[PDB]
A paper describes a structure:
mNeonGreen, an engineered green fluorescent protein (GFP) derived from lancelet, is one of the most brightly fluorescent homologs of Aequorea victoria jellyfish GFP (avGFP) yet reported. However, we were ultimately successful in creating a variant, designated as NeonCyan1, with a tryptophan-derived cyan fluorescent protein (CFP)-type chromophore, and two additional mutants with distinct spectral hues. NeonCyan1 has the ‘double humped’ excitation and emission spectra that are characteristic of FPs with Trp-derived chromophores in the neutral state, such as mTurquoise2 and mCerulean3. To obtain insight into the molecular basis of the empirically determined biophysical and photophysical properties of NeonCyan1 and its variants, we determined the crystal structure of NeonCyan0.95 at close to physiological pH (pH 7.5), NeonCyan0.95 at acidic pH (pH 5.6), and NeonCyan1-T207D at close to physiological pH (pH 6.5).
A late-stage variant, designated as NeonCyan0.95 (with Val67Ile rather than Val67Met), was used for structure determination by X-ray crystallography. Inspection of the NeonCyan0.95 crystal structure reveals the locations and interactions of all mutations introduced during directed evolution. Notably, six of the nine mutations appear to be localized in a new dimer interface between monomers A and C of the asymmetric unit. The asymmetric unit contains four molecules of NeonCyan0.95. Calculation of the interaction surfaces between the various monomers (779 Å2 between monomers A and C, 439 Å2 between A and B, 312 Å2 between A and D, 272 Å2 between B and D, 272 Å2 between B and D, and 0 Å2 between B and C) strongly suggests that the symmetrical dimer formed by monomers A and C is physiologically relevant, while other contacts are likely due to crystal packing. The C-terminal MDELYK sequence folds into a helical conformation and contributes to the interaction interface. In the case of NeonCyan0.95 (pH 7.5), the structure revealed the dimer–interface interactions of the protein (discussed next) as well as a water-bridged hydrogen bond network that extended from the indole nitrogen of the chromophore to the hydroxyl group of Thr207. For example, there are two well-defined hydrogen bonds between nitrogen atoms in the chromophore and amino acid side chains. One of these is between a nitrogen atom of the 4-imidazolone ring and the side chain of Glu220, and the other is between the nitrogen atom of the indole ring and a water molecule that is part of a hydrogen bond network that also contains the side chain hydroxyl of Thr207. In addition, one face of the chromophore is closely packed with ionizable residues with side chains potentially bearing positive charges (His72, Lys153, Arg205) and negative charges (Glu45 and Glu220).
Author numbering:
A (entry chain C): 13 to 67, 71 to 235
B (entry chain A): 7 to 67, 71 to 236
């Protein structure tokens, strides 16, 4: 179970290179995590909001014990993550995650590639103001894979929603225990907070999983 | 087990009052699914164009539609018994504005008639409420406690989005007064967390409202997550 983490998040938005590193803590019994990120290449020339929710499900417990994300970390086996975001304006963003566990400390490597953002849109003009809390639906297509789907929205400087759909594929090196497979789908609620400058992000995230729940399809 | 399939599934609302002395009055018919926590409502002004943000009437525009994980909510139990409950909600805004809503219900058979008396005061004259420049609301959790056998107190943090993409924040407290004491399975099982999503399509004289709600019991780390 983890207490501390660090993130190296890097890549390009519309070919604009960015690199950010920082340290964080959390409570893996309550699904809380905190992160400070600093630009290693000066002022971000795009909305810092575009890095949310991408800026550690090792912090997410399940109702009656560890999440499969936690079980895989404790075992040492671990998991890789591929997220694809498809935006209402035709823009696309991909994030690849690689983790190492230097003790009870998680080291995150997040490779991001974003293309097709309109030059005068709110992402490239840094005019996004907020994000909404979000439900995700987690299914186990096989005993090695978790696919998470959610609908994501940013608020723009004009008070409109800037919408995207997301699919996250979790690939475990080692199968998930049998007693995870009997409980699907799994619905997770997440709230995030971001305080930011041009070079620094202060991120918080609260998350909670719900298992044998009826009438959650339209609601999520 | 409770006869959930038989619960009333039609309602009407008469919502009226004033916002900074701007009088309004709307009447409309709705339907829903009390087994799945879904309700729909159409409202039409009886006094022409609303001269403030229709968003200010959300979430105020029927917890008779809300089931509990193992049966009737107390709201539905009180309706089925016939004793019923009354509602008082206070919204306190970041700019010092305040809004109160008093609800009274009567059950004309399977049909719920709600009367919602609204008084909003203290809104800045050139703010987004009085100038009709609010654009949206967020989905919201509420926490319900039972301070005594005839009372439910619900608290939540509410936010509107403004024309500038900022949050216009309020804190809310809703007190439910039951004419008859609530059953044992309610009082021993607290607090209750309710997640709600709303949809609003509106003109200056007509609102089309939708709400989805789901109650959760015996949940652990909800203290900060629900806010």
């Amino acid at each position: 179970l983890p207490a501390t983490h660090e993130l190296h998040i890097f890549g390009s938005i519309n070919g604009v290179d960015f690199d950010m590193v920082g340290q964080g803590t959390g409570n893996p019994n309550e699904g809380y995590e905190e992160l400070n990120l600093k630009s290693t290449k000066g002022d971000l020339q795009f909305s810092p909001w575009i890095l949310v929710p991408h800026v550690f499900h090792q912090y997410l417990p399940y109702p009656d014990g560890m999440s499969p994300f936690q079980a895989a970390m404790v075992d040492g086996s671990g998991y890789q993550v591929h997220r694809t975001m498809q935006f209402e304006d035709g823009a696309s963003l991909t994030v690849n995650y690689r983790y190492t566990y230097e003790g009870s400390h998680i080291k995150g490597e997040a490779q991001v590639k974003g293309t097709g953002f309109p030059a005068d849109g709110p992402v490239m003009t840094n005019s996004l103001t907020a994000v909404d809390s979000c439900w995700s639906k987690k299914t186990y297509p096989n005993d090695k894979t978790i696919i998470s789907t959610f609908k994501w929205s940013y608020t723009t400087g004009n008070g409109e929603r800037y919408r995207s759909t997301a699919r996250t594929t979790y690939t475990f090196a080692k199968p998930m225990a049998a007693n995870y497979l009997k409980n699907q789908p799994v619905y997770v609620f997440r709230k995030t907070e971001l305080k930011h400058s041009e070079t620094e992000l202060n991120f918080k995230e609260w998350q909670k999983a719900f298992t044998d729940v009826m009438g959650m399809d339209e609601l999520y």
